[PDB]
Amino acid sequence: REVISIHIGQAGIQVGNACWELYCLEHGIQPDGQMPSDKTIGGGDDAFNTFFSETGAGKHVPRCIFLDLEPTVVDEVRTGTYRQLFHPEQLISGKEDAANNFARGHYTIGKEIVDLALDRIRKLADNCTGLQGFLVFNAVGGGTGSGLGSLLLERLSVDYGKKSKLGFTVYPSPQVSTAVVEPYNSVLSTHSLLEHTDVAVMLDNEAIYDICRRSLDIERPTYTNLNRLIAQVISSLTASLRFDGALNVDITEFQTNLVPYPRIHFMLSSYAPIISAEKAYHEQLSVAEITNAAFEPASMMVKCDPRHGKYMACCLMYRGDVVPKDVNASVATIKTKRTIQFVDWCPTGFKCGINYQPPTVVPGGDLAKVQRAVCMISNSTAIGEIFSRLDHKFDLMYAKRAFVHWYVGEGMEEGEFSEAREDLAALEKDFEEVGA
Amino acid sequence: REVISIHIGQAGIQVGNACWELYCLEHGIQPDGQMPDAFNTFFSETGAGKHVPRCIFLDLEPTVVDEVRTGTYRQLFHPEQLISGKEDAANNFARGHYTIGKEIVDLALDRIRKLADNCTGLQGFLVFNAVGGGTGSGLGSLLLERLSVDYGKKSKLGFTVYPSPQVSTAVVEPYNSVLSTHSLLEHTDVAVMLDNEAIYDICRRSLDIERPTYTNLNRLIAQVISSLTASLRFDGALNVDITEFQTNLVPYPRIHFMLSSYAPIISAEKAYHEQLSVAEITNAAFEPASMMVKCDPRHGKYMACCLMYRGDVVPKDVNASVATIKTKRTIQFVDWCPTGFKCGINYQPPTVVPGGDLAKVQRAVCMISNSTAIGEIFSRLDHKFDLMYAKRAFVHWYVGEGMEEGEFSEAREDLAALEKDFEEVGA
Amino acid sequence: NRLRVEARKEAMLAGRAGKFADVQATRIKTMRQLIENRKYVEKHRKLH
Amino acid sequence: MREIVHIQGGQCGNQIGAKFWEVVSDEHGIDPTGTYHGDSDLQLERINVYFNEATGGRYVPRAILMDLEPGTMDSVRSGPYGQIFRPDNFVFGQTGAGNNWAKGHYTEGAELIDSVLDVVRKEAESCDCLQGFQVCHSLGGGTGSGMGTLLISKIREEYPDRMMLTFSVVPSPKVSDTVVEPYNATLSVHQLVENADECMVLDNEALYDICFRTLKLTTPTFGDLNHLISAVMSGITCCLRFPGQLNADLRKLAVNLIPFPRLHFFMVGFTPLTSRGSQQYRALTVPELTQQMWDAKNMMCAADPRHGRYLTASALFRGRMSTKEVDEQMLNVQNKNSSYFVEWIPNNVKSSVCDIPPKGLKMSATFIGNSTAIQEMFKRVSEQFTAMFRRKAFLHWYTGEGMDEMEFTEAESNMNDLVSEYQQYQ
Amino acid sequence: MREIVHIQGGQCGNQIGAKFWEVVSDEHGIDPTGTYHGDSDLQLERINVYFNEATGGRYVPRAILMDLEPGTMDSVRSGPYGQIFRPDNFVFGQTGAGNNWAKGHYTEGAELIDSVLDVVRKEAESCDCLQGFQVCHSLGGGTGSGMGTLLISKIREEYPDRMMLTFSVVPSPKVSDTVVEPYNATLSVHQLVENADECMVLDNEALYDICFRTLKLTTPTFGDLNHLISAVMSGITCCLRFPGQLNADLRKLAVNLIPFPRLHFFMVGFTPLTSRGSQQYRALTVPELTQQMWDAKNMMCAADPRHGRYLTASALFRGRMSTKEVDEQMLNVQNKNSSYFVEWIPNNVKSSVCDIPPKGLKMSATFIGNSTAIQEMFKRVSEQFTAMFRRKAFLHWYTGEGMDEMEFTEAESNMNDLVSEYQQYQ
Amino acid sequence: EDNFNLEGRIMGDLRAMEEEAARLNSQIEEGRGAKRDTLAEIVEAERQIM
Amino acid sequence: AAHADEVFSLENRKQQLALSMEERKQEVEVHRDGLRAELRLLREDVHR
């Protein structure tokens, strides 16, 4: 059981840099691809053969691609802490950047590099045996994670097809944002993110900032703070393929029974217990408490209030010393609760899943080591609010034909500016149609 | 079985500091919060030998809330149970009830909710405040109303500090108390009275301290609280909890105001010389000078009493002392109580705080009585509030805050009805 | 038994309407204090 | 063959029953562990009336503890001889009646009674021939008065041909410990006169006076009061476990004592009670035992029998003795004190002998009188009830919890006619 | 000499079987390594029913293990008594279940069952006289519900005469640990009714309630639930492996328990279930065993039998026993409540005895009842299926893998008619 | 947001009150049926005594 | 001014909802209390 990951755009490489950091130490691999010779701590030898592949002399290499157009951020990895870890072929960087222009990153510049990217993907997958699926990290509000990413998505769907695609995509928050053309660069990529990404787990930066300030107590967080809990979530939801447990739920079961219709796949992610290093010992962290905290409206990686929506399905991947009784009792109390609702056609809402490995915390990190943890990946109906507000702020800019020349001169037309508009409209209509 | 503690304002959190200082050494927990089945009422076991309490210290002026964090108990509490605002209500009921108060009671509820959630056998709430102030009165009333509308079915014990007849710090604390009477008359289930003049006189006579400060009062109040809750915490020959306390000490819905008296308040130099028999300490508890409240009991008739004994006490001497008291004539039990004592006996002697002002005494008594002599306190306060309110002095501060003359008028009328109710039920 | 039950119910409801004498006023007082505080959002005491 | 199941209500009942089992287990010869280690076979020969064999010589009592707190049960288990009990019988809530009859009879009683009847049914089905139940409780609390009353009424609606020995520790004024005793005592006797069949009156006032005067104790805690009550309770019912020259079991005692269909309130004594200094300077003759037995400062009741006539009396002697000596002793007593005996009952006194005395005491006796002085305790509690109830003191704690005013007045009337029947027959 | 073959499929099936072989191996006295180190020579006589001696005493259990991922075979081999299973009996796939009945029963079925039939047929030839098949699997999963069901189809197509015990766990509302239970429950029960012979239906809420009430456990887990299921599965075949006063073969159980060929969904329970805290208080006697059996709190399935009518029942007993007391108990329980049994059948209850109780006890039983109150079990899943399928929820995972909605409609119809048949026979 | 949460919680409290009311109604109906059938049984007992 | 009007209206609606809930909750409380009194009277009658 193996999965090969692809990172695109500034967010892609940064989340990769703060995610493989967690992966290597969770599997106890030194930053030069060598397990310690004298001591060793791990569940088994075949635990790391899902992310890192050994090659002869005990020199593991990750199953990652870092592809980007600008070299100014790939060089950071090339000269950073893990230079020897990644071997030079898994690091693809173009000559110049895409610069927030979806068309520029999609058609002209991305053409020269997508074939190289997929030609490395194939010679990475051939060595693989139990290829579970493809996990992708990108920021849709950009010129590389949107354009090149949405080109590679089609160029992989044409090559493999029915394989599971877990795309963890970052949209702009309504308030906090770092661009002007992000509504265009988001809706245009959404039009093709709907039709190819099988499970699009949505993220947001304001929501993670609020989580970090509220729980972790840090008043001035940053990307090095956000990407750490992003890595925490990805490890929490991927650890079932790696570390055993009573109730195991892998990527197949996850992707299989959280998507009720072939187009309603838009998850909200949440992680509990997010707690600092000065309250963890003062808090008795029981299964019921962490479950309620995970289901709190004020703890979501997307800034959407679910009280306006209904949980179509839920999937709780627990970790660590969790006995499979209190989890059942807690989900029973959740069903009994009437603040949060379900939908009338899904009387069985939850996937419990339990892994027997406690969370692993980076030394010199803001997150404290704890016995247990839980990741909630719920399919809801309030994401229509997110898409509605995005479109509402898109209309105010498109009605003036603003910034359109930067696209049309790059080569595109208004046909897709209208097509993405109507496709997002149909997406919203489907959401409020199924919600009833 | 648990009761959760809320401390509102200056006096509340200072008395709470004393109470938790006493509790940690009561149960053997080091101040850093680690032990080297009975603590369950107050602490809650967490971690590998950690015991955090069930208190919330909430106040507006941070200069005294953060004193706990700076102090030696910074590791004991949950770092967000210490709710601090940004600017005190400035002894202004209107300010602490309307302007600033409504922005902190939401957080207070958001914490007390999960406190109650981690609690299982919740017996009730116990709150500390001084209605002689602004926050302790206004925020106290608001938070108490919120707890009443949320839970309602759970009892509340409010240990209220009151303006003494002569020792009065502020000049508007009559206003503060007459404004808080509405909440303390219908939300608190059991309201325990504490004056400062009476406690000062007790310190001056029994303990012979010439110039006492706010540490002695806090210690002597923590002792009373501990004696009240020892029945729950430790074992006992004849026990009594909050439910029996209330079903024996609240004969009528609108009569709940207790007088407390601890005994024997004896220093270590006279502890050796005084043999301290059970009848002796019971008489010293009932004598009209060891009570914490300035109100002449002879200026009234007793209605009910409760006596919590701690230490080496057997249940024959308590009964003999009660018979002697009923045969005494200086105190006139009212006819509707042919029996008038809820006598409870425990098995854990009092615990002495190091560097304290009390000795290791084998046995101790805590008396809590309901009588009709508190109408005197209410009448004196009503007259001394009317004196100021005739000229409408200082009212413009509350009015400018937003509170109108209404709540003043209705508060005065509620005091009048309360006074008439005590005077009538006295007959 | 029916008459006794109804007597108990009516006495208790009267005792609680005594309390509701104290909720109706708290409605009108809050309404009146809210209609006026709405006009002090600009200048709370300088407009005075 | 005959069976007795013992139920303990409230803290007072639990402590009295714990001491009772501590006594009776020794009188049967079994240690706290539950394995017999005695000497003779006359013990084991009829222990089936109390105990059940579990697994190879592990005898478990047929008792059910029940209250509304876990602390009392924890204390009972922590105490000695508490291991023998079956953990299944330990039924309890968590809130606590709080000396409230409404809690002990209407809310918590309702929410626990269905569970407790399951275990009492289990015990009453595991047996073969029931003759009556035992209940130990007070009349001045919530878990003891109201809940015990509900339990006995639920039993009567199920076993309408059986007796109950309800040992009621009546709330005495001079030993009162809670502010509302009468509001519980009156409302308990209301149904005690209706359902229970042998109510044994006891009072801490008389127990303390006995300990002070006869025993000459210096620090009498509840241990010795429970000791005396347990000795009485174990002595009343040895006619089953032991063979006597004249055997008289529970139904015989009831039919002999109770002349009219509602006068079942017995006042009880026990002999010989001695200080360990005067036990070396006395003779335990049968006339001496009888004189101490009729000594008015020995009955466990605050009502002096000199204040009324004796409807009837019964004596239960233990130890090899002379039946003619017993009968002539009681005849001499009746002839000398003929003014204290009802005129329309010839030979007002019953006597029985068992050939085994309580161990240590080579001879002993027990007294059960049905004297009309019992009305004193009831008038002495009715005065307090009326005095409180005239102005509805402490009444909202029950009215708000579900009781109308008319119930208290009906209880007053029932108490009044109960205390009036004794006056009528005196 | 009457051979039994055990078939394990699904993760739950593999765990339950790895515990069942644990109990059987320890009671026949073979140590973990694989040799024979028992004490008594009566166990050696029937080890052929479950074991084969290869060479040198290394007994190999006669079991088939199947799944779709190696992550369950790893655990099976790791667990205690893991080395016993013959390495040839680990048919595993490489893809995984996916919780889709389509992948379980159509796609992966073709390339897995064709490969495992070789092993099962080789095992059948290796043994001499097949009494039948016992298969322990799941109904809420992908491998046990679908691939196990298709294997049931193939095995019944091959051997028509042999009986089949189907130890199947079913989903539940309160313990719904996944979100497509209704689909994989209906699509399995449709074949299960037609194709099996004795459906041993279990669940998880019933087992948790047992481990909480009767066993008083603190943190019950899958280990404990599988231990209980193992105890039942060993009790069901006690008779073939040990002699007794009245033997009971599998065909005898089926004949005495089935009045109609498609009415064969039984409900099972174990006895005695006592807590370790109060082990030494209860009495291991036939009346107590029967009282513990005949009640809802002990049945190992979410059925309230008193809300239905026991059509038939069977009771296996183990230990030196008196059939007189056994059948007087089985008749008294039958005549106490004639309403809860059917009118047109005299002697609704079969009994059987064996003279060797399980290790660690001295007296045990096992109750297997064919009731009509088991219809509501399927009624819950049927109503869930209606609500979910009316809006085509999750349907594409099925209709994109060679499946048609006609299959769903017909499976729902079959469940409806079965539950109608149960309801009618009342 | 606060008004939305308020309305939801009020509606929940309402359905809770009707839940407990339905429980009480069912219990009282059971009790009335038991009382009337007990009267029938007492009549049958009188007939048997006769 | 428009924003203040909206906020003021929302506050009024919140407070009115709270007070109406308090009233209706008390009403159902007294109704259930009457049902309970009828219940207990029935239980004592049926027991006798």
Ligand SMILES: Nc1nc2c(ncn2[C@@H]2O[C@H](COP(=O)(O)OP(=O)(O)OP(=O)(O)O)[C@@H](O)[C@H]2O)c(=O)[nH]1
């Ligand atoms: N929350 C979070 N967001 C990030 C992080 N790194 C990058 N982003 C997002 O990415 C945006 C930066 O531009 P990108 O969308 O990545 O553009 P690009 O994919 O690098 O392509 P170019 O525009 O050509 O550079 C920011 O607005 C962020 O919202 C990160 O570490 N955490």
Ligand SMILES: Nc1nc2c(ncn2[C@@H]2O[C@H](COP(=O)(O)OP(=O)(O)OP(=O)(O)O)[C@@H](O)[C@H]2O)c(=O)[nH]1
């Ligand atoms: N017994 C006791 N009383 C105290 C202590 N500290 C303050 N007080 C009382 O507090 C009363 C006046 O209240 P304030 O000084 O206004 O304090 P407050 O009640 O919290 O009100 P704010 O200052 O507005 O927060 C005085 O009459 C004191 O008796 C203390 O340590 N022990």
Ligand SMILES: Nc1nc2c(ncn2[C@@H]2O[C@H](COP(=O)(O)OP(=O)(O)O)[C@@H](O)[C@H]2O)c(=O)[nH]1
């Ligand atoms: N003999 C005896 N009587 C006791 C003991 N403890 C309390 N009592 C008496 O029992 C009465 C209280 O009854 P209680 O058990 O508390 O009833 P409850 O309030 O319903 O629990 C008091 O009047 C005491 O005099 C004891 O240990 N022994």
Ligand SMILES: Nc1nc2c(ncn2[C@@H]2O[C@H](COP(=O)(O)OP(=O)(O)O)[C@@H](O)[C@H]2O)c(=O)[nH]1
């Ligand atoms: N009682 C019990 N139930 C189990 C155990 N293991 C798993 N289960 C449940 O039974 C079902 C088995 O189906 P599943 O494991 O998904 O089958 P598979 O994954 O295809 O092999 C799961 O949904 C679990 O909820 C166990 O040890 N005991």
Ligand SMILES: [Mg+2]
């Ligand atoms: Mg870029």
Ligand SMILES: [Mg+2]
């Ligand atoms: Mg202050």
